[PDB]
């Protein structure tokens, strides 16, 4: 057998069924909570470029899409669930995706605005603003995906083991 | 410093106070002000650029009928009508051209088709006599434009001289890069200064009805902007 | 407030609901009658490039498309409604557009052939040739659009105020 | 008449009845809600030293003190009501003040921990953590005071007009 | 980087999960673990220094009686008793030495005085026969101490060898700088490592009763610490 | 975990509930006995400085303070309960403490007069002189405290393990 020594900067993507991610249900008129939480695993470094695709595909408990006036906001945080204004990306509305062809089509493929980085212990949150008198989010059917592996279109999330590279700490301090 | 956000007809980054909505006027055809956004205290400034910033604006109207014994299954309208980006078919559109709701039977009402030539639309159901109905068809035959206000209701300029028709606005398939809409003009303002989005058309549009199934707020605007923190 | 001094060469498009344009119904086998007339406003100059999109969407009174063997011809005219052989553009058939995706699709987007210009008082007409024993055109539902603002695809109609530039007279 | 040209660095204190401050009622287990908000007025700069006294005197609607296990946290915020980890001061409990002699006594006078500054447009919030099954805060009777004017004990809040000093921009 | 916070027997900066409380044991006199704090995931490390970091710890116990026809107005106790920092008088103390509550009459019960020599206390009211009562007097005759745990229930060391008595802890007037209490020892730990606060005393202390007027949580701890973000 | 190697000269205080201390009741006109006895534990060395606080808080059996004309005397002893005149400290009256604020207040805080030292096997006694026709002392409620840990005011009792330091024997002979 033979396998190629693939580069440390591995091309990956994020989704629900992973250990360093979590979600929880949401009601209405309810900005403060992360519907979805992400955290940096230990001794790893994640990198999200500016042209990274984004793809929330939330649902209602009865299996429906929500009010497109709903808003989604990805946002970096300092440790301790402490958000920060700078570094925010993807302040979008829940409408205007066409989930059918969303990831499928590079046109519909909504990318981020600016670059981003996740040091080994950091947080990225996904806040949601639903107008009142509306249905709530259901975590069983909701989903997030970011990055585009497995396609000549779109970009992919970079990852690297912190212990391999020597300037990994330099890039971590650089943020 | 700089970011690229979306702003909506409600709340968003502003907070539902420094927005304000309004309907148009029918009998005097006049360049009403249907929406306006005032730069809050906290921001430094807002920018706006054409051929850089995307946009969406889905308006509608409201009309009503009266149930009768005769099997109507069709209603005329007071507004010019066409399909959403063109097609005879329903449920293929980016969104329904028209929605209907029965007050008595608190249920949605599907749509089969329409002539799309005269002010006509079909109903798939068979309304009963005396039953009250509401309908929120597409809107047409209008113009939209922008202007700036320096804290006083006192205009200083205009983003772009020539109005774009909402008719055409519905005609293009939205939300496609390359085919996305991008107006012209390069505006910018600062604290407590307002951008007004203005309408010139006959038919009475709506913002809220409290009995519309597909979301609470019927119409919508979603515009891209650039902000300095 | 602050607005940027946009360039004089403004990027625009033409349609029915404008003052310097007009239309009138058409029957059958009536080439000389212009279905649509355009005129140059005062002290303005319009410019239509060669790669300019074109988009007629004529209809029948009953709300139908007409015989695709029908022909459409855009044509420049000297003053006094007088046509010309040179300067004509877009001698096309009424079929083979697929009006559904016509403006939508850069593929279906049919462009002109050669450049064009409209001095301040000039005319551009749109003649139509319908075969006999067919239905006539209905102005309530018909429409023209040319130029492509608001899209990275296609081209737009240039306009300029004559009273701003000094060599505008030389260009005219 | 004659008045002395007092120094620009004026010695002041904050309280409820001011324009650039606000409060709102609080229930129970509501950390994110600020009970009190402060904002920098226009073209002014506020400075709070590290040894600055602090004095919340919250109450219950019935006119009682709350559970001393309750927590109070003063915290600086970036613009847009956004908190920050650095710059925070006075993460204290609601008990162990003895409000009777609190401001009175330099002993009971609880000071801050580290220095602080407020540029012209910035925010400082006062979050409160009440345990559940307790009574809520009542804004009519609650109050904040910080700084100590009018006493040889304690420190005072510095203020300056931004438009007077030239290096005020550098200090900001 | 570094800050100076307070930490409490509930929630606070931690979040109510990586705290845990517990009562002591009575018949076997043993160095139980009444409280413990585990450094969460998010912090880098925690420090702790004596003669630098202040402290407060108000414990109590619980006892009960039975109403009788005879006018009691006094109850014995099973715990050594003294005033809060010493005084014969009530309502001058930094806090009440004792609290009483009647189940039937869902009201507080004042206190007049006590002997403070034997296990005695007075009641100002006149309880009825059959009425149920609860009382939360001061606690005495105990020792408190610290120890560290390396994620496993596996001790590595001890902050300070010699225990300090809670008796003395109540005796000093708290919350006065210069007279403030400051233990000895200089500890520090990191993620998921625990500090346990331990008790050695006979009488059964409490943390929660759900029928105590002066706040929900009866007892309390409030300690100063230094944290690296 | 990490603990600091605290110095051998540990700062401590004395009270009733300890093994190397004891007490017993006293009557009236009764000097000779130690109401309270202290002894040096094995292989330790205690040191009491001259500015050390002192705090007897004796009581009556009924729970009262005694006649303030009563006298208290701390006194060092040679082995065998054998007192010595030199080295005596704190010949005070039982009155004039104000037990309420006594330890609490540095003013009321009554300190010793001269230095003192306790070699590994030595004794310190606390004699009491009550005038006749008075109430006796009750050991259940009485108490001694010396040294002031846990306060910027006052001093603390030094202790050291004799086995650690080499000149511990030198200081012991020095007394």
Judge: F150–E173 Cβ closer than 8 Å, yes or no: no
Interface of A with B in 50-79 (CB under 8 A): 67-69, 71
**Residue B92 sits in which domain range?**
60-139
Q: How many residues appear in chain C?
A: 172
Question: Is residue A85 less than 8 Å (CB to CB) from chain B?
Answer: yes
Taken as a whole, chain F contains a residue count of: 175
Instruction: Tell me whether residues E216 and D107 touch, CB distance under 8 A.
Output: no
What CA–CA distance (Å, rounded) separates B78 from B70?
21
Beta bridge partners of B33: B198
Instruction: Indicate the pairing of strand E186-189 with strand D34-39.
Output: unpaired
User: B–F contact (≥3 CB pairs within 8 Å)?
Assistant: no
- Look at chain B and report how many structural domains it folds into: 2
Nearest residue to D122 via CA among D20, D54, D30: D20
Yes or no, beta carbons of D69 and E5 under 8 Å apart: no
Burial of C55 (0-12, 13-18, 19+ CB in 10 A): buried
| Unique residue bearing structure tokens 């403030």 | E180
| Minimal Cβ distance to A85: which of D32, D80, D85 | D80
| Contact predicate B36/B207, CB 8 Å | no
CA–CA dist B66, E204 (Å, integer): 77
Q: How far apart are the C-alpha atoms of D92 and D110, rounded to whole Å? A: 9
Tell me the C-alpha distance between F97 and F113, whole Å.
16
- What is d(CA F116, CA D65) in angstroms, rounded to the nearest whole number? 50
Query: Which DSSP state fits C65?
Result: -
B chain contacts of residue D80, beta-carbon cutoff 8 Å: 42
Q: What is the rounded CA–CA span in Å between residue F169 and residue C83?
A: 128
Cα–Cα distance for residue pair B152/B194, rounded to 1 Å: 9
- Residue A48's Cβ-count burial label (10 Å; 0-12, 13-18, 19+) is buried
Q: Residue F23 has what DSSP assignment?
A: E
Cα–Cα distance measured from residue F83 to residue F32, given in angstroms and rounded to the nearest whole number = 10
Which tokens hold the place of A82? 């402490």
Instruction: Tell me the CA distances in angstroms from B83 to B171, B173, C17, D145, one per residue in order.
Output: 8, 11, 19, 63
Choose one of E139, E160, E194: the last residue of a domain.
E139
Q: B85: burial class by Cβ within 10 Å (0-12, 13-18, 19+)?
A: buried
> Within this chain, do residues E85 and E44 fall inside the same structural domain, yes or no?
no
What experiment produced this structure? cryo-EM
Q: D138 in contact with E at a CB cutoff of 8 Å?
A: no
Please give the sequence-ordered ranges of beta strands (E in DSSP) within E59-176, or none if there are none: 63-66, 74-76, 100-102, 108-109, 120-122, 132-135, 143-149, 155-157, 164-165
**Residue B206 contacts A where some CB pair is shorter than 8 Å:** no
Secondary-structure percent of chain B, ordered helix, strand, coil, rounded to 5: 5, 35, 60
| D131 contacts D30 by C-beta, under 8 angstroms | no
Q: Are residues E125 and E158 in the same domain?
A: no
CA C146/CA C54 separation, integer angstroms: 5
Tokens matching residue C33:
């009658």
CA distance A93 to A132: 16
| Chain A nearest C-alpha distance from B67 (Å) | 29
Determine which helix (DSSP H) or strand (DSSP E) holds C169, and give its type and residue range. helix C168-171
Nearest to B185 by CA among B149, B156, B161: B161
Q: What angle do CA D145, D148, D150 make, to 5 degrees?
A: 120
**What gap in Å lies between CA F127 and CA B191, rounded to an integer?**
82
Cα distance between residue A144 and residue A54, in whole Å: 8
Q: Is A7 on the interface with D (CB under 8 A)?
A: no
Looking at the fold, whether E25 and E77 belong to one and the same domain comes out as no
Q: Please report, for residues B5, D75, F136, the alpha-carbon distance to residue D122 in angstroms, rounded to integers and kept in the order given.
A: 22, 12, 69
Phi–psi pair at E210, nearest 5 degrees: 65, 5
Phi, psi of D161 (to 5 degrees): -80, 130
Tokens of D116: 């602080």
Taking an 8 Å cut-off on Cβ atoms, the answer to whether D82 and A83 are in contact is yes
Buried b (16+ CB within 10 A) or exposed e, C67-83: beebbbbbbbbeeeeeb
| B95 and B194, same domain (yes or no) | no
Q: Is F174 buried (19+), middle (13-18) or exposed (0-12) by CB count in 10 A?
A: exposed
Closest by CA position to F125, among listed F82, F61, F157, F65: F82
H or E segment to which residue B56 belongs? strand B55-58
Q: b or e along E59-93 (b: 16 or more beta carbons within 10 Å of the residue's beta carbon)?
A: bbbebebebeeeebeebebebbbbbbbbeeebeee
- Which two tokens mark A103? 């990831």
Half-sphere exposure of D51 (CA within 13 A, CB side): 4
The resolution of the experimental structure, rounded to one decimal in Å, is: 3.8
Smallest CA-to-CA distance from C45 within C116, C96, C135, C107 is with: C116
Closest CA to A122 of A10, A23, A41: A41
Interface mutation target, options E84, E168, E176, chain F, most CBs of F under 10 Å: E168
Tokens of D69: 């296990």
> CA E50, CA E35: separation in Å to the nearest integer?
19
**Which residue, of B117, B139, B161, is where some domain finishes?**
B139
Q: Is E167 helix (H, G, I), strand (E, B) or coil?
A: helix
- In this structure, the answer to whether residues E55 and E76 fall within a common structural domain is no
Residue E229 touches chain A, beta carbons under 8 Å: yes
Of F28, F32, F21, give the one whose Cα is nearest residue F127: F32
Q: Who's near D6: CB < 8 A, 6+ residues apart?
A: none
Is F19 at the interface with chain E, CB within 8 A?
Answer: no
From the list E15, E16, E56, E19, the residue with the least C-alpha distance to E37 is E19
Place of tokens 């999109």: C53
Integer Cα distance of B184 and A2 in angstroms: 58
Shared domain check, B163 and B102: no
Question: What are the chain E neighbours of A81 within 8 Å (beta carbons)?
Answer: 42
Q: Which chains touch B (3 or more CB pairs under 8 A)?
A: A, C, D
Contacting chains of C (3 CB pairs or more, <8 Å) are: B
Lookup result for tokens 């304000």: B20
Query: In whole angstroms, how far apart are CA B113 and each of B83, B119, B140, C65?
Result: 10, 13, 18, 17
| Residues E32 and E64 both lie in one domain | no
Nearest to C46, CA basis, from C8, C79, C84: C8
- Token representation of residue C136: 């006539």
Q: Greatest CA separation found in chain E?
A: 65
Comparing CA positions, the residue from B1, B89, B57 lying closest to residue B207 is B57
B227 and B155 share one domain:
yes
Domain range for D145 is: 1-172
Backbone φ, ψ for residue A12 (5° rounding): -140, 180
Distance (Å, whole) CA C131 – CA B188: 55
Structure token digits, residue C104: 């939508």
Helix, strand, coil distribution of chain A in percent, nearest 5 = 5, 35, 60
Of E9, E174, E216, which is closest to D134 when you measure between CB atoms? Answer: E216
Contact B217/A at CB under 8 A:
yes
> B65 by DSSP, 3-state: which?
strand
Last residue of a domain, one of E81, E104, E139: E139
B180 and B207 in a common domain: yes
- B118: chain C residues, CB-CB within 8 Å: 63
Separation between Cα atoms, residue A168 and residue E213, nearest integer Å: 56
Asked if D80 is an interface residue toward chain A (Cβ–Cβ < 8 A), one would say yes
Burial zone of F130 (CB within 10 Å; 0-12 exposed, 13-18 middle, 19+ buried):
buried
- Contact across the interface for A67 and B56, Cβ inside 8 Å: no
Query: F57: helix, coil or strand?
Result: coil
Q: Token pair 């330890």 is at which residue?
A: F103
Calculate the CA C128 to chain-centre distance: 13
Q: Tell if the CB–CB gap between A96 and B175 is shorter than 8 Å.
A: yes
Report the gap between the CA of B179 and the closest CA in chain C (Å). Answer: 5
Q: Any bridge partners for residue B122, and if so which?
A: B74
> B with D: 3 or more CB pairs under 8 Å?
yes
Q: Does B41 touch chain D (CB under 8 A)?
A: yes
Number of compact structural domains in chain D: 1
Radius of gyration, alpha carbons of chain C: 17
E strands present in chain A: 10-12, 21-23, 34-39, 44-48, 53-56, 71-78, 82-83, 89-93, 110-111, 116-118, 123-129, 144-146, 157-161
Note whether C75 and C90 are within 8 A (CB): no
Q: How many CB atoms lie within 10 A of CB D125?
A: 20
D104 CB-near residues (< 8 Å, 6+ apart): none
User: Which site among A28, A84, A95, A135 would you substitute to test the B interface, given the most B Cβ atoms closer than 10 Å to its Cβ?
Assistant: A95
Place of tokens 């407060």: E56
Structural contact between residues F73 and F127, judged by C-beta atoms closer than 8 angstroms: yes
Nearest CA in chain E to A120: E42
The torsion angle over the Cα atoms of residues D94, D98, D104 and D109, rounded to 10 degrees, is -50
User: How many Å apart are CA D69 and CA E219, to the nearest integer?
Assistant: 9
Put simply, the answer to whether A121 touches E229 (Cβ < 8 Å) is: no
- Residues shown for chain A: 175
Spatial contact of D145 and D32, defined as CB atoms under 8 Å apart: no
The torsion angle over the Cα atoms of residues C151, C153, C159 and C165, rounded to 10 degrees, is 110
Q: Which helix (H) or strand (E) holds F170?
A: helix F168-174
Q: Whole-angstrom distance between the N-terminal and C-terminal Cα of chain C?
A: 36
């Amino acid at each position: 057998p033979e396998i190629g020594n693939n580069g440390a900067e591995k091309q990956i993507s994020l989704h629900k069924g992973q250990p360093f991610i979590d979600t929880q249900d949401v009601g209405a008129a309810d900005p403060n909570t992360p519907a979805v939480t992400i955290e940096g695993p230990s001794d790893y470094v994640i990198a999200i470029d500016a042209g990274t695709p984004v793809a929330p595909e939330f649902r209602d408990a009865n299996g429906d899409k929500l009010d497109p006036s709903t808003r989604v906001t990805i946002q970096k945080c300092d440790k301790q669930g402490n958000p920060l204004g700078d570094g925010i990306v993807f302040s979008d509305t829940l409408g205007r995706f066409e989930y059918s062809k969303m990831r499928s089509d590079p046109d519909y493929m909504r990318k981020t605005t600016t670059s981003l980085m996740i040091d080994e212990r950091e947080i990225v949150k996904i806040f949601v603003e639903v107008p009142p008198n509306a249905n709530g989010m259901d975590a069983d059917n909701s989903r997030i995906t970011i990055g585009d592996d497995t396609s000549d279109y779109g970009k992919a999330v970079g990852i690297v083991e912190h212990g391999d590279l020597s300037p990994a700490e330099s890039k971590a301090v650089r943020q | 410093q700089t970011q690229e956000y979306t702003i909506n007809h409600t709340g968003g980054v502003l907070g539902d106070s420094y927005v304000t909505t309004a309907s148009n006027q029918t009998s005097p055809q006049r360049e009403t002000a249907v929406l306006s956004f005032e730069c809050p205290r906290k921001f430094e400034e807002i920018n706006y650029v054409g051929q850089r910033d995307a946009t969406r604006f889905v308006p509608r109207t409201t009309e009503s009928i009266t149930g009768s014994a005769n099997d109507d299954t069709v209603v005329d309208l007071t507004a010019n009508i066409q399909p959403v980006a063109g097609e005879e078919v329903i449920a293929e559109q980016d969104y329904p051209v028209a929605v209907a709701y029965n007050v008595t039977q608190g249920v949605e009402v599907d749509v089969v088709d329409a002539d799309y030539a005269a002010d006509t639309v079909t109903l798939g159901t068979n309304p009963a006599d005396g039953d009250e109905v509401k309908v929120w068809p597409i809107m047409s035959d209008g113009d939209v434009q922008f202007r700036l206000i320096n804290q006083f209701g006192q205009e200083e300029g205009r983003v772009y001289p020539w109005s774009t028709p909402l008719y055409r606005w519905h005609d293009f398939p939205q939300l496609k890069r390359g085919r996305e809409i991008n107006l012209h003009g390069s505006a910018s303002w600062s604290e407590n200064e307002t951008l007004e989005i203005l309408l010139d058309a006959p038919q009475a549009l709506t913002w809220e009805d409290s009995d519309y199934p597909r979301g609470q707020y019927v119409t919508t605007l979603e515009q891209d902007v650039e902000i300095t923190l």
